[PDB]
Subunit: 187 residues, 6 copies
C-alpha cells in the first residue's frame, strides 16, 4: 500500500537500497520520513536487520523551550501503525526490536544490524550529527531526514562514497487533495 | 439497536458514507456524535479503516479553566464505545492503539492514514486549531467534526467538494420520553 | 439467597420490574440499596442490560469536608461480593461492565442499556439530581436510593409516569437479631 | 498441625462453633487470634462462609502515634495465613477479596454477610468503635473479637445470647519450650 | 556443589541439623551465612519447612546513618541465586515462600514451619535479639549469623539446651586463591 | 557475526579463555568491551556460568557530576546485548536476574559464584573501588575488567598468576569504513 508515487520518491528509495547512509531532505509531505520508515520495516520483516531505531532531537522548530536540558516522538509511534499491525507494536517496543527515543539516548552506542532513522535533523547541531553518524555499526543502514544546521554536513560529506543526499521538493509532496483545497480556502 | 431515527439522521449517515469530511452540527441528543462513532466502529469492523481516533479539545463551555494550558472531558467518549464495542474488547483496542481517545493537542504533526477520525465538541475550537486538525487528513481516511470559529469554517469551506455540512436540529433530538417529562417537571 | 422479606420489600422490587425510574427511600437496613443492587445483577446476568453503574455523591452525612472540591465507595464494592463471585468482580471492573464511581463522573453521559443506581441521594442537590436523571438512555433502568434534598424531586415528579417512589420504613429493616440486642445493650 | 492443646483452647473453639459472636481474651501465645483464624480458614474451605475479613485498629499499646489520624501493624495477620493457606494461593485470595486484611476504619458502612470476621487487638478500641464493628454483622456470618473499653463490652453484653466470652490464661500459652528458656536467660 | 570444606564448616552444618537455634559466628568468607542459607534451601526443598525468612538489621558496620529511623539486603537476594534457579526466585518471593526483609518486619510474629536466618547479628542490640529469638514457632529452625552486642547472648544462653554456638575462624575462610593473592598485592 | 578480527583481538579472547581475570585495555572500538560480552554470553549459553553481571561506575570522563553521590551511563551495555541475545529473551533474563546490568556500588558485600562479571569503563575507578570489585570473585566465575588508578592495578597485579593484561591498540579498532571517512570529513 505504501509506494513511491513521484520520480523523486522512487530515486530516494533506490538510494536507500544502494547506500549505507542516506540523507532525505524535503518539505513536510514529501515522503522523506515516511518512506524511510517503510524501508526500515521492509528491512526488519525480511531479516536484513534485526531492529529499527527511530530518533529525533529534543528541539522543535518554532516551539518554545519546554524542558530542563514525548509529544515530539508521537508522530513516529503513529506512523508505525501504517506499517506494523498495531497489536504487534507493543511487543516490538518491549523487546526493543523497535525503539523510538530522543537523540541523547544514542550516545556511546554502536548500532549493529540495525535500521536507524534520525528525523527532523534540521534541528541538530554539527556536533550532534557527528555523534549520530559515528554510531554506525556493521550490517546497519542510516537515514537522516529533515526539512548552519545540516547544510554543514551536506557540504562536509559531499565527496564521501556510500553516503547519498536525496533532495525531495514540493513536487514530491503527495497529499489527499482535500488538504490542498482546505489550505487554499484558509488563504 | 443503533440507527438513524429522524430524516435529518438518515441524511447525516448518508453524508458520512459519501464524503471524506463531514461536519455534524446540532444540539445535544441529536445523534451528531453518537452516530458518527457508530459509523466509525462499523468502518473498523468491516475493515474500511484500521483504526478509530476520537478527539476533543481541552476546553468546555461555561467550565472554569482547569490546568496550566497545553480525562474528565474525555470520559463520555470512552463511555459511548461501550454501546458499540464489547466492553472487554475495549482495553485491548486501547492497548493496541486501534481505538485512540486523546486530546486535540495529540494530533499535531500526524498524518492520519487508514483512520476514522472524529473531532468532537468542535465549537470549543479556534480557526487555527481546526486548520491543524483538518490538515492531518491522510489517505483512506474519514473525518467527522461534530459540535453544538466553527461558523468561520462553515463559511471558508462552503464551496469545497467532498466536504459536507449536516445541520441537525431539536427535531432530531431523540431521547427517552422520561427525560423530557423530568426536564419539564423542573421547569 | 437475596430475597425481599417484608411486604414493602416485595413492593419495592415489584416497582423496579415495572418502572424505568424508581426511588427507594428508607432507613439503613431496609434493603433500599441492597435490593436494587441485586436486581441490577439479575438484570446483567439475564442480559436485560449490558452493564451496571453504581454511584454515590462525594458528600457524606455528618462527616467533615475531606477533600478539595473512595472510603465512601467501599460499601458498594463490598455488597457486590454477595451477588457476584469475588474472583469475577475484578474482570467486570476492568471491562467496565460494572462501574463503581462518584456522581461527578456521570456528567455529559448517556446511559444506554445500563442499570444505574444513585445511592445516598439525600446527600444530593436538586441540580445534581437533575443531571443524574437526565443521563437516562434507552433500554436502561435507574434506581435512586437514600435515607430540601430529594424531597424536592419527590414533589416535582409526583405526577410523572414510569417513575415510582417506594417508601420503606423501620418495619422493613431486617437485621440479624443480635444487632438489635447489641444496640439495645448499648442504650 | 493446628489444634487446641489446652482445655481452655478446646472450649474456645467449641464456643466459636456454637455462637455467632465470640470474644477471645487472653495473653499473647494463648491461641486467641491464631485459633480464630484457623476456624475462619476452615469455614471458608468447607463453604460455611465465602470470605474472611481480618481487621485490627490503627493503634498499638506503648507505640508512639505514627500518622495523621483516620501495614506494619497488619503484617502479622498476613503472616499467620501462611500457616493455614498455601502461600501461592494467598495473593489470589487477596486479589479476589476472598481474604481481606484491613484496618478497622474500612469496616464503616458495611454489612458483612456470609463472612468470618475477626477483629484483633481489640483492647486498643473504644466503646464507639466496638459498637460500630459489632453492628456490621450480617446474615450467615461469624465474628470473633480477640484481645489481650473492652471491659465495658464484657459488661454491656454479658446477658446477651449467641455471644460468648472465652477467657484464656497463661495456662493456655503453649510455646516452643526454647522461648521460655530464653526469656528466663534474659531475666 | 555447596558443601562444607573445613572441619569447622562440617561441625557447623552438623549443629544446624541437630539444634533448633544455632549461632554461626565468624569472619567474612567462613561460610557462616552462606552455609546456613544452603541448609535453609535444603530444608525447603525437602519439605522440612514451608518457608525461608532471611533478615538483617538496618544498621551496617562503619557505614554512616543512611535513613530516618535495600542495599544491605542485596547480598541476601544474590546468594539465593547459587541455590535456587534464578527464574523460580521471583515466584517464591511473590508467594512469600522466600522472604528477604529487615529485622523490624519480624515484630509481633510467630514463625512456624520456617527456616529463619538473622544475618549480621553483630549489628543488633540485646533487646532486638530477644525480640528475634522469641519469634520462634513450632517446626522451625533459626540460625543467627555474625562477625556488648551478641556477646551478651553468647554469655546469657551459654547453658541453654537446643541452642548452639559455632565459632568459625580464619581457618574456615575458603576463598578462590586469587582473592588472597590480590589482597596481598594491595598490602 | 561476532569474531576477533585482529591479532590483538584473537589474543584477548584466548586470554579470557585461559585466565580467571583479564584486563582488556584499549581505545573505543577495539572490541575490549564487546568481545568480553560475547564471551560472557557464550559462557552462559554453554553453561560454563549461570549468570552474567555487567557493571560500570557512576562516573564518566568529561561529564559533569549528575547526582547526589552514592541509567544513561548503563544504556550502551543493554544495547550491546541485543547483538548477542534474542531481544525478546532479554527482559526475561533481566527479570530472572540471569543477566544483571548494574552500577558498581551494587557489587558491595557480594561473592560472585558461577558468574561471568565484566566491569566496564574501569579507567573511571579508584584503587579502593577496584580492590572491592576484584575481591567479589567467587568460585567457577570469570572477571573481565575493561577500560580505555587502573595504571596502579596494572603495576600491583603485574606478578599475579591467572590474571592477564591485554593491551589493545588503534590497530585493533575495526569499524565500518564510513565512520573513519566521516570523522575525516569533520577534521
Amino acid at each position: 500500500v505504501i509506494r513511491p508515487k513521484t520520480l523523486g520518491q522512487k530515486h530516494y528509495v533506490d538510494a536507500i537500497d544502494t547506500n549505507t547512509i542516506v540523507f532525505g531532505l524535503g518539505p513536510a509531505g514529501s515522503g522523506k520520513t515516511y518512506l524511510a520508515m517503510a524501508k526500515a520495516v521492509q528491512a526488519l520483516q525480511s531479516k536484513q536487520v534485526s531492529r529499527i531505531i527511530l530518533t529525533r532531537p529534543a528541539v522543535e522548530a518554532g516551539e518554545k523551550l519546554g524542558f530542563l536540558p514525548d509529544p515530539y516522538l508521537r508522530p513516529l509511534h503513529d506512523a508505525l501503525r501504517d506499517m506494523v499491525e498495531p497489536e504487534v507494536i507493543p511487543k516490538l517496543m518491549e523487546a526493543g526490536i523497535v525503539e523510538v527515543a530522543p537523540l541523547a539516548y544514542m550516545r556511546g552506542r554502536t548500532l549493529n544490524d540495525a535500521f536507524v532513522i534520525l528525523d527532523e535533523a534540521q534541528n541538530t547541531t554539527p556536533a550532534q550529527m557527528k555523534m549520530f553518524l559515528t554510531r554506525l555499526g556493521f550490517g546497519s543502514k542510516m537515514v537522516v531526514t529533515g526539512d548552519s544546521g545540516l547544510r554543514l554536513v551536506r557540504h562536509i560529506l559531499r565527496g564521501v562514497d556510500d553516503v547519498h543526499f536525496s533532495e525531495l521538493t514540493s513536487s514530491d509532496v503527495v497529499r489527499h487533495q482535500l488538504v490542498g483545497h482546505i489550505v487554499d480556502a484558509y488563504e
